């Protein structure tokens, strides 16, 4: 019936003055745009069909053509920025927002989806969707006593679109828009559907990626314990954004970081730091590095939770990206830690894997490692143990590695290493 129409036929139907013919042709367009491979989005755009689809959105008297054009426009908007722009340029934004009030759940849902694609394109369209007043009617769709009464797919689409309104930076979303959205987000974060949880965590992760003021507005909503709970979920699609959000939060103030610790987050890290997915290990190690950049009492928590041997572990063997984060965690630890905490570090076996990493071509990690080594010597100086450390670095091949670095290209590298040698290795 409406399967596999040429664009030409679609145009002919839509240009006819017969609403049924238009409906038929519009559905045909929807099916082209929904096919598995290479939807002919540009061809549809060039045929000049967008203004017609947009006008069909306003036809309250013919709900099916509203649905079909909503669906077609949604899929056009799912493409490149230029393709999304064509949809916006046609006046689709306010028309879609008007459809959020539709008595037909399947039409309202489709409009939710479309606005998600538009906002998803980037900051400008995101903020334009907000300026057109999308937030109030979107939130109103979620104003029910129990989210469980909503159709599952419907709730998922709502959550996803809301997460796109929280997404992107340069600039980040308007503060008042974030305040307006947050209480619903907190609520979605306690829902029991895995996809709603995943997308809610993504939204929280976007919101906490920025200046400490941004983190604060999320953290004061009391979501950290729930985020930590989700950190221990069995679904990787939940753990991943939950962990990204926890990582973002510990980039904040000592107080913001302490909330993460207080909520029991550190107890999950033996699993995270040995997680089969390398991206989880990397994010988790990055997180640890920002925690070891914290207060001495926060470093002590890392110690108490038995996490230092886990850091020695990733420093010893992990993908290179994770190893670099491990190196950072060590330099941060030795910069902020007490002498005793630093001594503990050496006793866990940090020295050997630390030295082995000096074979890395990465110039930045070499700097990180040399610094850490400097910091550890400074602690051994307070204890008069400098020579015990020199010998330790000597026997694992470290001194050989420091020696060569004297001839390294980078200025601070050979300078840092020359200092080490002519000081502790003479």
């Amino acid at each position: 019936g409406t399967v596999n129409w040429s664009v030409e036929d679609i145009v002919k139907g839509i240009n006819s003055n017969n609403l049924e013919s238009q409906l038929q042709a519009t559905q045909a367009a929807r099916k082209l745009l929904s096919r598995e491979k290479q939807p002919p989005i540009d061809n549809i755009i060039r045929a000049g069909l967008i203004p017609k689809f947009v006008s069909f959105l306003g036809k309250t008297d013919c709900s099916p053509i509203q649905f079909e054009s909503a669906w077609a426009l949604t899929n056009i908007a799912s493409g490149t920025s230029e393709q999304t722009k064509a949809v916006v340029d046609g006046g689709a934004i306010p028309a879609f927002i008007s459809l959020l009030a539709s008595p037909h759940a399947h039409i309202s849902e489709q409009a939710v989806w479309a606005l998600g694609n538009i906002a998803g394109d980037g900051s400008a369209f995101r903020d334009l969707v907000i300026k057109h007043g999308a937030i109030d009617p979107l939130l109103a769709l979620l104003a029910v006593p129990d989210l469980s009464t909503l159709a599952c797919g419907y709730l998922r689409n709502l959550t996803w679109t809301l997460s796109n309104l929280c997404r992107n930076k340069n600039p980040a979303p308007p503060l008042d828009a974030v305040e307006q959205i947050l209480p619903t987000l907190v609520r979605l974060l306690h829902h029991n559907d895995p996809e709603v949880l995943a997308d809610s965590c993504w939204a929280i992760s976007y919101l906490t990626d920025g200046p400490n003021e941004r983190i604060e507005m999320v953290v004061k909503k009391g979501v950290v314990p729930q985020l930590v709970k989700l950190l221990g979920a069995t679904e990787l699609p939940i753990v991943t954004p939950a962990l990204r959000a926890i990582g973002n939060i510990v980039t904040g103030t000592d107080e913001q970081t302490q909330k993460v610790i207080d909520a029991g987050a550190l107890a999950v890290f033996p699993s995270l730091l040995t997680n089969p997915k390398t991206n989880i290990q990397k994010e988790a190690t990055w997180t640890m590095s920002n925690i070891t950049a914290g207060r001495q009492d926060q470093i002590q928590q890392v110690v108490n939770h038995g996490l230092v041997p886990f850091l020695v572990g990733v420093l010893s063997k992990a993908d290179f990206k994770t190893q670099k984060e491990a190196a950072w965690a060590i330099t941060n630890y030795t910069s902020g830690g007490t002498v005793e905490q630093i001594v503990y570090l050496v006793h866990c076996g940090i020295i050997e894997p630390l030295m082995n990493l000096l074979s890395a071509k990465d110039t930045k990690i070499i700097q990180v490692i040399l610094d850490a080594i400097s910091n550890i010597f400074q602690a051994a100086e307070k204890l008069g143990e400098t020579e015990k450390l020199s010998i330790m670095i000597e026997e694992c091949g470290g001194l050989d590695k420091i020696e060569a670095l004297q001839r390294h290209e980078n200025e601070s590298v050979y300078k840092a290493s020359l200092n080490l040698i002519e000081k502790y290795f003479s």
């Binding site: 939807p39 899929n75 493409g79 997404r167 991943t240 973002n248 950049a293």
Partner: peptide
């Protein structure tokens, strides 16, 4: 004592910006 290190930009693990409805 060092400063915190904010997230460095990247879209790799990041989920899709947009969704096309197939059915």
């Amino acid at each position: 004592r060092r400063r915190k290190r904010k997230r460095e930009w990247d879209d790799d693990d990041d989920p899709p910006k947009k969704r096309r409805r197939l059915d």
